Amino acid sequence: MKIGIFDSGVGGLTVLKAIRNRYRKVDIVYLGDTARVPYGIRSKDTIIRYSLECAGFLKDKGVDIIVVACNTASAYALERLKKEINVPVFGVIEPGVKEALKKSRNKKIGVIGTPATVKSGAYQRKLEEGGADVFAKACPLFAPLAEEGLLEGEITRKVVEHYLKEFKGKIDTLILGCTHYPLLKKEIKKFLGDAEVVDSSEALSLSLHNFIKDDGSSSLELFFTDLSPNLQFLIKLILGRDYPVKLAEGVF
Amino acid sequence: MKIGIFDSGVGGLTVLKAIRNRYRKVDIVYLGDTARVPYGIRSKDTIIRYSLECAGFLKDKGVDIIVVACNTASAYALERLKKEINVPVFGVIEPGVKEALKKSRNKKIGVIGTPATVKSGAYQRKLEEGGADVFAKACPLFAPLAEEGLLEGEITRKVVEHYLKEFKGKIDTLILGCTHYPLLKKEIKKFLGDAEVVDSSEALSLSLHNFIKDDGSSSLELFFTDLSPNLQFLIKLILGRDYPVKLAEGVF
């Protein structure tokens, strides 16, 4: 059993840590699309093309299942991936939803996710057909225009309330689609008050239990299509140690 | 007297507010380069070309002085601007330095700024020739690869200490060149302890006092080369109300 996880950046090294602790002996191969990283703005057809390519990379790496930890690719490319890669494919939306639907009490739940996944409607849908009033809202893309340091103090506690306006006191469960400053977990869980935030990474990992045979050499291989700046440093902080990465289409 | 302030994004609407409160009757024309916004990565010659163009835009808008609030353009394009625009040009580095040099006690001061301005050496230099041990370090470019929400808790308090490592307990004054998550003002002023952070915007504004004749119709015009997403919303939050913006090279 070899698990292939694929993401645009390093946010997927989270799921990967969950998997790996639960499935202690499975072999893993990660592939981050760092060379194209600002995914959540690209078209549906772009997201499906970049996804096809990265999945094929891992397929050809001999994996058994392909976990796609990105909400944007999971929201647009799962049909296509499945249909072109002769293996099981798992995204992070459906486990998030199942969980949300479970955790909830009043079934008035919300989703904060990238503009491109929030546009897809995949979350909204899957939640409604499960019997639940979805309150969605998109991630604010701030760093390009202004430095987050601008959004510190006063102005931050006002971005929040205006964004998480409707959500106000109507929801009781939330899928943190994708968190960007100033909408950190603790800036929102403060405005909204102690709400049940779905852990999309623990939910996902768990969700692969019946398809995964906990077996393998316990190996780990990390790949990225661009040896970006502080990649290596980030890897160190998230995983706990330093794992050597290779470049996608290097030795091969 | 008409003041032309120019920046890459909205971070300059800060200086603009300082100016405007101090110089209550001067007329103003702001120009943000939103269409090209990720400035701090481009080349010296690129920064000088984009700067030339935006300054010329304002010159042709009939301004008397041109304030450039971006550290990256101030660090590479002031010679060129002055030499091509027949008017007084003021950047945000030299007032920051004067202030730093003043505020300091032990003259062991630091600068956290974008990789491109920190490379320029303009801060380091100007501080050394003023008799001071500069501790510089670059802004970590994180949002592209991973979402800041990843950098929340544990991992954030560890990014800081490793970056503001050397600075540790050696500095007593700091020029917050440019603040990006997780290096917010309050994450650093916590690691480092209560240090004297230079207010580069109050310093700058103040620095124009002898060149500015507080006179004019008290007008305000906001221009940007790309009516980017939440531009309009950000403007609202920083300035206090909504100011109509126009597009650079619109009616003209």
Curated annotation (Swiss-Prot), chains A, B:
PROSITE patterns in the cross-refs: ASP_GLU_RACEMASE_1, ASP_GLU_RACEMASE_2
Family: Belongs to the aspartate/glutamate racemases family.
Keyword Flavoprotein appears in the UniProt entry: no
Record text on subunit structure and interactions: Homodimer.
Record key words, sorted: Cell shape, Cell wall biogenesis/degradation, Isomerase, Peptidoglycan synthesis
Name this protein carries in UniProt: Glutamate racemase
One Pfam family it belongs to: Asp_Glu_race
Gene Ontology terms describing biological process: cell wall organization; peptidoglycan biosynthetic process; regulation of cell shape
Active-site residues annotated for this sequence: 70, 178
Enzyme class: isomerase
Listed result of changing residue 7 to S: Strongly reduced catalytic activity
Pathway named in the protein's UniProt entry: Cell wall biogenesis; peptidoglycan biosynthesis
Cited function: Provides the (R)-glutamate required for cell wall biosynthesis. Converts L- or D-glutamate to D- or L-glutamate, respectively, but not other amino acids such as alanine, aspartate, and glutamine.
InterPro entries membership: Asp/Glu/hydantoin_racemase, Asp/Glu_race, Asp/Glu_racemase_AS_1, Asp/Glu_racemase_AS_2, Glu_race
GO molecular function: glutamate racemase activity
Residues reported in the UniProt entry to bind substrate: 7-8, 39-40, 71-72, 147, 179-180
Keyword Cell wall biogenesis/degradation: yes
Temperature dependence: Thermostable.
Protein's organism: Aquifex pyrophilus
The enzyme's E.C. designation: 5.1.1.3
Catalysis performed (reactions): L-glutamate = D-glutamate
